[PDB]
Design a protein around this ligand. Structure first.
Ligand SMILES: [Cu+]
Length: 172
């Protein structure tokens, strides 16, 4: 297990400094980084594991219309730090993270070209794999919704985490 450490503090936003009396805490945020994935069934929630049928893709537009579809993080242009903090003794095998890109086309790689790999870290050796904080560039000239799709796969068991964050990336 683990949780998002940076950018920002969402706890600070929930706090009375929002003004003094009002708030927009988005309290669905208790454990979203730790969104589990299981091989086989059950899932408790609705079906996941649907990537080869693309039920979790073409049908996953409904997941981008879900009650559980928590909030867009607003980021202006330039690089930002993205850091996760963990309580894991668990052995990762690999983690990698993508953004969606708008405007897919069936005549083209659509189930891959839905996205862009924005970074990857395999479990291998050196302080390169040890890095748990990474800096990602945000274009300075564009505005638009994206989802970060991230996977954090575990060597220790056939089950993993698979997690998403909606964002709204904008200009400098
Ligand atoms: Cu855990």
């Amino acid at each position: 297990h683990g949780f998002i450490e940076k950018p920002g503090s969402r706890a600070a936003l929930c706090s009375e400094a929002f003004g003094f009396l009002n708030l927009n805490c988005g309290s669905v945020m208790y454990e979203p980084q730790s969104l589990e994935a299981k091989k086989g069934f059950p899932h408790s929630g609705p079906a996941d594991g649907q990537i080869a049928s693309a039920g979790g893709l073409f049908g996953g537009i409904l997941d981008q219309q879900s009650e559980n579809r928590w909030f867009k993080h607003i980021m202006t242009g330039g690089e930002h730090t993205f850091t996760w903090t963990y309580t894991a003794p668990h052995n990762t095998s690999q983690w990698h993270y993508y953004i969606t890109k708008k405007g897919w086309d069936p005549d083209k790689p659509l189930k891959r070209a839905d996205f862009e790999l924005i970074g990857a870290v395999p479990h291998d050796g050196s302080p390169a794999s040890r890095n748990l904080s990474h800096h990602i560039y945000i274009p300075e000239d564009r505005l638009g919704y994206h989802v970060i799709l991230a996977v954090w796969d575990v060597a220790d068991t056939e089950n993993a985490f698979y997690q998403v964050i909606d964002v709204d990336l904008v200009n400098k």
